[PDB]
Design brief:
Elements (H helix, E strand, L loop, with lengths): L16 E5 L7 E5 L6 E2 L24 E6 L2 E5 L2
Antiparallel strand pairs: 1-2, 3-5, 4-5
């Protein structure tokens, strides 16, 4: 019943992942892990659990990390 892998709300995957958009068709959204050390991020990667359309392919950085800017519109999950 709890359809997962494919996603619409973080809730159906949970703490450790977020409901990221697909790179193939915006139509599809899937579970993606919280951003780990060095992975790309977006400053608007809203907290978990988010029930809305995340819009981005990104997930918030893991608790012991923060989404810091590296270049124009390019942020990464660094240690903070």
């Amino acid at each position: 019943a709890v359809i997962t892998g494919a996603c619409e709300r973080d809730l159906q995957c949970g703490k450790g992942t977020c409901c990221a958009v697909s790179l193939w068709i915006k139509s599809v959204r899937v579970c993606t892990p919280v951003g780990t050390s060095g992975e790309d991020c977006h400053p608007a990667s809203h907290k978990i659990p988010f029930s809305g359309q995340r819009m981005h392919h990104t997930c918030p950085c893991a608790p012991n990390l923060a989404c810091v800017q590296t270049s124009p519109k390019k942020f990464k999950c660094l240690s903070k």
